[PDB]
Write a protein that binds this ligand. Sequence first.
Ligand SMILES: *SS[C@H]1NC=C(C[C@@H](C(=O)O)[N+](C)(C)C)N1
Ligand SMILES: [Br-]
Ligand SMILES: [Cl-]
Ligand SMILES: [Mg+2]
Ligand SMILES: [Zn+2]
Length: 426
Amino acid sequence: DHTEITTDSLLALLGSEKVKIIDVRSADAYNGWRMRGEVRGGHIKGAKSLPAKWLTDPEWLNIVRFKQIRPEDAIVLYGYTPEECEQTATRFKENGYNNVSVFHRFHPDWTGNDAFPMDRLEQYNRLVPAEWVNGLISGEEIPEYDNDTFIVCHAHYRNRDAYLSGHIPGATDMDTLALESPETWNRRTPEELKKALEEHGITASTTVVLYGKFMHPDNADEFPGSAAGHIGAIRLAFIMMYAGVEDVRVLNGGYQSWTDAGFAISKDDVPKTTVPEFGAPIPSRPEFAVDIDEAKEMLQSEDSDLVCVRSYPEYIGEVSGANYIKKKGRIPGAIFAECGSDAYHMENYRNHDHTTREYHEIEDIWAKSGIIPKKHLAFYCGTGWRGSEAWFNALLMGWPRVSVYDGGWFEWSNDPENPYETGVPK
Ligand SMILES: *SS[C@H]1NC=C(C[C@@H](C(=O)O)[N+](C)(C)C)N1
Ligand SMILES: [Br-]
Ligand SMILES: [Cl-]
Ligand SMILES: [Mg+2]
Ligand SMILES: [Zn+2]
């Protein structure tokens, strides 16, 4: 039996540092998706995201603490209904949080009056929920979509089994080698790009929906990237967006999210349906891609920064980060934005279910090191995969000048003329 907080008391508490307001709905609803047909979607201004879905995760309590939600705080929970909050509030009280309220009236009361402040992930419609994808493939009517032509694409890196072992019904598979070169690990040339997309059945006016499957990347193995399918997907989204595919979506949390929602999976080897003309000059969005000359410019410019999205061991030069990279070190002058544990994991940018981490946290961490939207930013990692994921996050926030420096450490370290640092920073 939980305390209730009224609409009015809550409104008067929105600036209080001791109150933590916690949205227990899915991360996609938090982000903006109007999952119940609500007119204004997103979250109560200043609310944190803690999906009720995550209650079955053993590390639940560490997530909460890592979100800086403390027993001294006044916790106010809300969902689509008060009932979805029941289990969360119990769980809080069971772990020593004695000040816990539930707000009953988020929808329709808070959402359906414009005096009540809400916030949302500005380009949330590019980061789609499973149910939207289901709607799309089922012929159903769905929000944030006014197109007649789509294609669901399962990304992988030389591992068709990641697709054949189970995929979204009707999706075709795209190897990441179709759009990037194994020589440079950079995007392919315009001509190749054109030909590969045509042959994958994609025009500039097609709504492409990208996802991949997480298969527990193991650093020991020859091709750990073959198991990091949803990073690969976001990488391909980058390239398609650069190319000039106007509407690219990424399924949030990958294949995982589709199955977690209990939707059916296929094992067919779906053949491609080619199209003859992409229908647009490639690349339409060249500003998304930055190359080494420009990268160098950006390093000696107040207006701009390179953002290093690698692991800490890579950063200090303990490991190269991959088995085809010989040199260990970092690019001098970049801003570190620690990806996670190694080159095939993105823990700092993701939740345990692989969905994007609460965007406010990404924002504030980035802000603490001067990664801010008024700069031209180029995100990079070893070859551009984690760079892409970081870039995509910034993009989702509406950041006006974000890029991927494609070459990354692999390109930079391949010229022995290029300077580099190593060891613990100074
Ligand atoms: S951004 S460093 C690394 N993270 C995952 C990749 C992809 C890479 C790999 O599988 O190691 N390939 C596909 C070889 C570019 N980059
Ligand atoms: Br992944
Ligand atoms: Cl680096
Ligand atoms: Mg590259
Ligand atoms: Zn917000």
